[PDB]
Design an enzyme around this catalytic site. Sequence first.
Site, PDB file in Angstrom:
ATOM      1  N   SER A  19       0.722  -1.238   0.171  1.00  0.00           N
ATOM      2  CA  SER A  19      -0.034  -0.032   0.126  1.00  0.00           C
ATOM      3  C   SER A  19       0.895   1.299  -0.059  1.00  0.00           C
ATOM      4  O   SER A  19       1.748   1.165   0.704  1.00  0.00           O
ATOM      5  CB  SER A  19      -0.832  -0.192   1.178  1.00  0.00           C
ATOM      6  OG  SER A  19      -1.651  -1.117   1.275  1.00  0.00           O
ATOM      7  N   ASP A  36       4.523 -12.012  18.243  1.00  0.00           N
ATOM      8  CA  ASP A  36       5.748 -12.748  18.806  1.00  0.00           C
ATOM      9  C   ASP A  36       5.458 -14.039  18.939  1.00  0.00           C
ATOM     10  O   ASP A  36       4.320 -14.496  19.032  1.00  0.00           O
ATOM     11  CB  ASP A  36       6.369 -12.206  20.089  1.00  0.00           C
ATOM     12  CG  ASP A  36       7.064 -10.995  20.065  1.00  0.00           C
ATOM     13  OD1 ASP A  36       7.150 -10.187  18.885  1.00  0.00           O
ATOM     14  OD2 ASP A  36       7.528 -10.309  20.849  1.00  0.00           O
TER      15      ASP A  36
END
Lengths: 203, 527
Positions: free
Chosen positions: B1, B76
């Site tokens: 984008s 994570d």
Amino acid sequence: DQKKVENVTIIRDSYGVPHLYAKNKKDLYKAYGYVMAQDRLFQLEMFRRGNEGTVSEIFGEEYVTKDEQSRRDGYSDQEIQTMLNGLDRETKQLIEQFAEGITAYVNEAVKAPDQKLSKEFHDYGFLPRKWKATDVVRLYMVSMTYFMDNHQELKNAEILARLERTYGKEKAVKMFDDLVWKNDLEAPTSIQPDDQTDIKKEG
Amino acid sequence: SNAMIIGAKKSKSGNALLFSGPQVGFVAPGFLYEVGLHSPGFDMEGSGFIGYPFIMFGANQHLALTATAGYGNVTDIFEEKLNPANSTQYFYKGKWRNMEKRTETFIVRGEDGKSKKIEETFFHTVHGPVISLDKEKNVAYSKSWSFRGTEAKSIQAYMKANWAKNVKEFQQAASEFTMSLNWYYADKKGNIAYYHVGKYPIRSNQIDDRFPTPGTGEYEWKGFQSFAKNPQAINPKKGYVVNWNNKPSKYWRNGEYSIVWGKDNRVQQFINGIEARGKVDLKDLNEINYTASFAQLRTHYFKPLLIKTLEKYQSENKEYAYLVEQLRKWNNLKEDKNHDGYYDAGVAAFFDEWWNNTHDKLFNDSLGIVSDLTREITDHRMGATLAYKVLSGEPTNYQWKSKEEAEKIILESTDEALAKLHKEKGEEADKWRAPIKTMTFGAKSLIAIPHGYGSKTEIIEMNRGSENHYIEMTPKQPEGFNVTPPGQIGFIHKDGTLSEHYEDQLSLYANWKFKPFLFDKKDVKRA
Ligand SMILES: [Ca+2]
Ligand SMILES: [Ca+2]
């Protein structure tokens, strides 16, 4: 054209884009859900099923793995309701209004399915269900989470392990640092150092 | 984008400008939903991703906004230490803990059209869902999102951005958004603002954040940083912000995903276009989008390196002399201005072959064993930083190739590309022109679930937003132009008839034409 749908005036332009003229936000957000359903009901249905992990109910066994991943990583209706209950009350109410507008189109279309339910529902032999605010949150999550969720740490672990096996740890570490760096100081940035001053670093 | 915001001082008219370009693929029905929202004190026109009760790309009476994916570090993975005697137990804060086992029941349409039930079992730990399990190595991997449980607060933040009437209110909304995006703002008083939004964890300083974190309890997150530490700027001194998913600021890190933020980065197309002009207008922003959409992105850093190497040897090789001339004349694009189905510059076909040859010679020997994981890094669609550093002789941690080897690669890649073109096409660059690549607006988006029937209409491939807005914030109101392909309405009648608005924006999109951005009701009524 210009039409009144309940208490909102809807102007659809030459491209079909709906422009909603409402007297308040409650009416506005119901009309917003309604026009989106008029235009995109099957797409909405399938996006929701994506987040729920119920695509395979429609498209068969080839989507079970995808559905599994979605249920594994997703939230129950009650967990999403808890999220909604933590919003400002007016915001929750507007999301509820948006769901009511989708539901209003669902109800209208189920009453006149040959003209108002798109071909995909006929081909796949099912009807759209009514919507709740939790389902609106599911529509947000199915797409927005995609831009955030990745397992690149695990790919990195695999790259390093394979390089260590092939070349030994010392060389593999250097190679990895060139593949996936800690911080490339020359990478182009949207904010340049000279665009503003961080006082604490002293000018 | 991609996105751009232009402040007053960089704008030809003195008005702030905004450009949107979210890249969410090309599907029919489309990924975007365009609407106009008007109630007392709230007037907004633009699009949002399908299903969202808010606009992301467009403008209200007070501000224009857009977004690009942040690529910030909000996921994570934890490496769970499993009990050798029980692979459903993992060690955490001093004791063996039991995984949560869940079984889910899926109702499945069989190939006979009837219901069929399938069950699958998955596991969770204290950190999150288990995404990979390896009993023989006594390890499992779980996943934690920094935004877990705050997705609805992110929706509320976006709705608040819609209702905002000034930068204070927009920034307040930005501070509440918990997922990783860049947000862009422009107002009618010439101001612009940029925010890398999201809730970013405070991680242990004892771990390498490019790899999974040990899950045994010593390395847990220690909260989330304050929003003031998120990269952001109001009215940056250079007078603009551009972005194509690139790094927000020099010391902002993103752990395992740094591969998108290197010295060679596709945002260079936007930087070059803005830096080459003095003051800009919306027509300029469109020209820059066109450039970025058709650019061979390796040209920025690799075409000068190629030219320099060939010039060194051109006195003894007239093919090199010819290529230097043709490369210098080439505008770096793969475009089809005469609509003949062939890219206009034949040397672009040479350059593509040269690049493929060069990437393979650089890395096939050394990284073939991990190519399924590293090709997407070393030939990444946003840039090829390592390849550039190796070929240019800049510092690297490992000596992938000597300087002599690097030069030899550049030359051999040229010779092989020449030989192939001579054999298959001819001697002159005009004979090398490659047929265009096309794309269609298909049935299956990035969510990986089909949502409709698609379209078979072929258009030239473009490295371009799925929609574009071009907005000038005049003192009176937002003005400008936009396109939202394929069309507004995804309905197909049971008899096969497409809505009249199913694909009535595809020609506009393919031909670099737009429709007016409508804000004043008098204009909306005539649209
Ligand atoms: Ca991470
Ligand atoms: Ca052509």
